[PDB]
Amino acid sequence: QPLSGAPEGAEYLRAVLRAPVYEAAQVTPLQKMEKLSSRLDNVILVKREDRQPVHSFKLRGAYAMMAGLTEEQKAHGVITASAGNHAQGVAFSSARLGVKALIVMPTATADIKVDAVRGFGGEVLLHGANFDEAKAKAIELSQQQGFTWVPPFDHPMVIAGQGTLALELLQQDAHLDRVFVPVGGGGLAAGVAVLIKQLMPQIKVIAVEAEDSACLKAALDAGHPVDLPRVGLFAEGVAVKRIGDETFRLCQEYLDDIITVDSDAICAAMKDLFEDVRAVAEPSGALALAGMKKYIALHNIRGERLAHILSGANVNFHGLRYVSERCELGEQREALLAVTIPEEKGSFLKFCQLLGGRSVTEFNYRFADAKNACIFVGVRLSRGLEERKEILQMLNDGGYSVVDLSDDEMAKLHVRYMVGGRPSHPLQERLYSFEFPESPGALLRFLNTLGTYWNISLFHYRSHGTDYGRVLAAFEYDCHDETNNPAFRFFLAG
């Protein structure tokens, strides 16, 4: 309990030091990013918060708040919240303190999230449609059954428990220059600032928020918790509409700066974490790095010791896909080509023969009658632009190609999933499916072996890292006759 007002600097310190976090939570490693740090020119360190048993930090504050309630036998009474990632923190906590918790969530949440909570401990009650709706209940039941509302953020105790991290940080590397903090409701940044600010003033504390969830920046600018019209939903755990409150706006008087960023950045930040530390972030968990990356360049900060927080790690395996897909876009990984090859009766072979070694990502074609049936080709590069530059020229010895891959947002994002369709007039073709161990030039072989005496009307191929069914081809190494195939009919045939 002991905080529900306007704690003063020190009071927070005290609360921080006195908070029983470790009974449930753990000090989290603070490791350095070797690739990135070396890339940019500073020491970059990450606060491995995903290593708590609830994979995020929330555990701290719920534990602190909840564990210092019981001084009032009001556990006997009870507790309740409404959520997805913090409902976890409470769950985990309720169980440890043997205090019954109730978690209210929307009605159509997701088995997965409902079981985690149920898992940790906690009883859920699925009641809502909207979130606000779930929370109206929670809050109801409070009042009626007397459960104790447990804030995801707006709370001195909750805040004090998060500072806990700061406390660790400073003891893990006191030669820190700047620290980057994610901003959802503001718990975490709030608890991190006060601390550091008390202990080591010279430490810079930058909040970092979602371009699309910029609760803070916005309230800042009005100097007023302000409701947001819309809130992005990538960075789930950061999707807050109106920042914290008092405690938050209040406390953000220790904040040194603020910075927003876009989903696309987050998606990179995720790539980064993974690649160096082999850590798996969750949008908001990567959010703060991204910011850094941003700040680094902005201010041309070279030479410092900076650290950010791997806030959490609750993400769907399949969510991973999207990410990649997005970074790929931002990267210069492949070549995307509109290569027109003259033939119909002859082959693609010749054309291939000069990409025999190079890695084929896509090679999609559909009969079309224009003396020159065009081909959507994709080639996995290494040397980026320079290597493409080759392919290109090289290919300049015959058919004429077009470099649809550079900035062709259209190809890169839609058309490379659209090449096909229908021919023109009915066709006496046959459909077949082929599969073959992927290698660096397996295709060729396939093609070579396939022969050159075919009136191939259709070709489809996506490859290393995205599909195991290898090829679908239509004429006029493993085979399956897929002729009158339903899909084909309805969309390709015609």
Ligand X SMILES: *Cc1c(COP(=O)(O)O)cnc(C)c1O
Q: Dihedral sign for Cα 16, 170, 205, 254, please.
A: positive
Sheet holding 148-149, edge to edge: 123-125, 101-104, 79-82, 148-149
| Contacts with its own copies, 190-219, as mask; x by CB under 8 A | ----------------------x-------
Site for its own copies in 390-429 (CB under 8 A): 402, 404, 408-411, 413-415, 417-422, 424
Nearest-approach distance from CB 51 to ligand X, in angstroms: 12
56 is catalytic: no
Distance CA 63, CA 58 (A): 8
184 is in an annotated binding site: yes
Region at 41 (left for phi over 0; alpha for psi -120 to 50; beta for the rest): beta
Q: Is 298 in the site for its own copies (CB under 8 A)?
A: no
Q: Which does 168 bind (CB under 5 to 8 A by kind): its own copies, ligand X, none?
A: none
Q: Which residue is nearest to ligand X (CB)?
A: 312
State the residue for tokens 């947002």. Answer: 409
Angle at 140 between CA 135 and CA 145, to 5 degrees: 125
Q: At residue 293, what is the residue type?
A: K
Q: Which does 186 bind (CB under 5 to 8 A by kind): ligand X, its own copies, none?
A: ligand X
Nearest-approach distance from CB 154 to ligand X, in angstroms: 9
CB-nearer residue toward its own copies: 123 or 408: 408
Rg (CA), the chain: 28
CB-nearer residue toward ligand X: 128 or 184: 184
Distance CA 175, CA 304 (A): 9
47 is catalytic: no
Angle at 402 between CA 396 and CA 408, to 5 degrees: 145
CB-nearer residue toward ligand X: 36 or 193: 193
5 is in an annotated binding site: no
- Taking contact as CB under 8 A, which single stretch among the options 195-203, 229-237, 287-295, 388-396 is the one that binds its own copies? 229-237
Residues forming beta bridges with residue 101, ordered by sequence position: 79
Q: Which does 163 bind (CB under 5 to 8 A by kind): ligand X, its own copies, none?
A: none
Distance CA 268, CA 263 (A): 9
Could you tell me the two tokens for 6? 């306007």
Nearest-approach distance from CB 292 to its own copies, in angstroms: 19
Distance CA 102, CA 125 (A): 7
State the residue for tokens 């953000």. Answer: 252
Q: Which does 311 bind (CB under 5 to 8 A by kind): ligand X, its own copies, none?
A: ligand X
Q: Is 95 in the site for its own copies (CB under 8 A)?
A: no
- Taking contact as CB under 8 A, which single stretch among the options 72-80, 177-185, 190-198, 272-280 is the one that binds its own copies? 272-280
| CB burial string 229-261: b at 16+ within 10 A, e below | eebbebbbbbbbbbbbbebbbbbbebbeebbbb
From 47, 56, 58, 135, the catalytic residue: 58
Q: Which does 185 bind (CB under 5 to 8 A by kind): its own copies, ligand X, none?
A: ligand X
Nearest-approach distance from CB 184 to ligand X, in angstroms: 3
CB-nearer residue toward ligand X: 291 or 378: 291
- Taking contact as CB under 8 A, which single stretch among the options 64-72, 130-138, 202-210, 459-467 is the one that binds its own copies? 459-467
Distance CA 272, CA 286 (A): 9
| Residue of 189, 191, 179 lying closest to 209 (CA atoms) | 189
- According to DSSP, the β-strands at 257-261 and 359-366 are unpaired
Q: HSE, CB side, 13 Å, CA atoms: give it for residue 152.
A: 22
From 284, 311, 347, 463, the catalytic residue: 311
Site for its own copies in 302-361 (CB under 8 A): 313, 316-322, 324-328, 333, 338, 340
Nearest-approach distance from CB 252 to ligand X, in angstroms: 11
Q: Which does 285 bind (CB under 5 to 8 A by kind): its own copies, ligand X, none?
A: ligand X
Q: Enumerate the known binding-site residues for pyridoxal 5'-phosphate.
A: 85, 184-188, 311
Q: Active-site positions?
A: 58, 311
Q: Enumerate the known binding-site residues.
A: 85, 184-188, 311
